[PDB]
From a paper:
MGME1 (also known as DDK1) is a highly conserved, mitochondria-specific DNase. Human MGME1 (HsMGME1) protein is composed of 344 amino acids and belongs to the PD-(D/E)XK nuclease superfamily. However, in contrast to DNA2 (2–5) and many other mitochondrial DNases, MGME1 can cleave various types of DNA substrates with a preference for single-stranded DNAs (ssDNA). Structural analysis and comparison suggest that MGME1 follows a two-cation-assisted catalytic mechanism of substrate cleavage.
The side chain of Phe261 forms a weak hydrophobic stacking interaction with the side chains of Trp152 and Lys153 of α2; the backbone O atoms of Lys257 and Pro258 form water-mediated hydrogen bond (H-bond) interactions with Tyr168 and Thr169 of α3, respectively. These interactions may help stabilize the conformation of both the helical arch and the β3-α5 connecting loop. Two well-defined Mn2+ ions were captured at the active site of the apo-HsMGME1 structure, which was hereafter referred to as HsMGME1-Mn2+. In addition to three water molecules and the side chain OE2 atom of Glu344 (the last residue of HsMGME1), the B-site Mn2+ was also coordinated by TLA and Asp238, via their O1 and OD1 atoms, respectively. The average coordinating distances of the A-site and B-site Mn2+ ions were all ∼2.15 Å. Unlike many nucleases, which coordinate Mg2+ (or Mn2+) through the side chains of three or more negatively charged residues (Asp or Glu), HsMGME1 coordinates Mn2+ through the side chains of His180, Asp238, and Asp251, and the main chain of Trp252. In the HsMGME1–Mn2+ structure, the C-terminal residues 337–344 of HsMGME1 are well ordered and fold directly back into the active center.
Residue numbers in the entry: 98 to 112, 118 to 189, 199 to 344
Amino acid sequence: QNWFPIFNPERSDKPSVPLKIPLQRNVIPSVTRVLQQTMTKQQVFLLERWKQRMILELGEDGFKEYTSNVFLQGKRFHEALESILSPNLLKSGYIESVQHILKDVSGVRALESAVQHETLNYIGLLDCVAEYQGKLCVIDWKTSEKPKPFIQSTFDNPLQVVAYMGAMNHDTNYSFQVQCGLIVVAYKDGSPAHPHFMDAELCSQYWTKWLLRLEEYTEKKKNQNIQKPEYSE
Ligand SMILES: [Mn+2]
Ligand SMILES: [Mn+2]
Ligand SMILES: [Mn+2]
């Protein structure tokens, strides 16, 4: 029943400089590694198909240019937000896009901070933990242009959020609990960012789907061996 709960019964739900628990190259499988390696063969086919289309269309140079820009713009956007919320890139559309979201953000308790689940044995790096319109949540910022477009599905974004909150709720480095999630899609053209707020009930529904992905990963033979070390969110 409560063998793998998202919520920690023992931690305070409510409960001033944000936590940055460092992350190093490690052999604990990350949240994004788990999701990437357990994408449905149907999803993998769609992304590989689109990858081959883009290589042919753009050429090897044009492909390198495209992938490099979307990756770096994804990273720069995240670095900017980490600098904004903790004591050059500010003219971007992505930053302009999140302004109406950032007005409603307060009580930032963590930023780009490692989370490791003590029972389930996965690790990750959550973007931010803060109150959005008074409600504490794990926030994950997203760019409308995917930073790793051929190995990521936007439709896995709710699972990534619930993985982080679950991990954080069962991590002795964190003394509080988090019950809600938020995904924020910033648009490259400066259009207002879209918030997808996830209450406790919805997080629990997606958490169940995350455990199915996590077990599907640990069902494999190669993942019983110790992975090669990597820094992965
Ligand atoms: Mn991140
Ligand atoms: Mn993010
Ligand atoms: Mn990764």
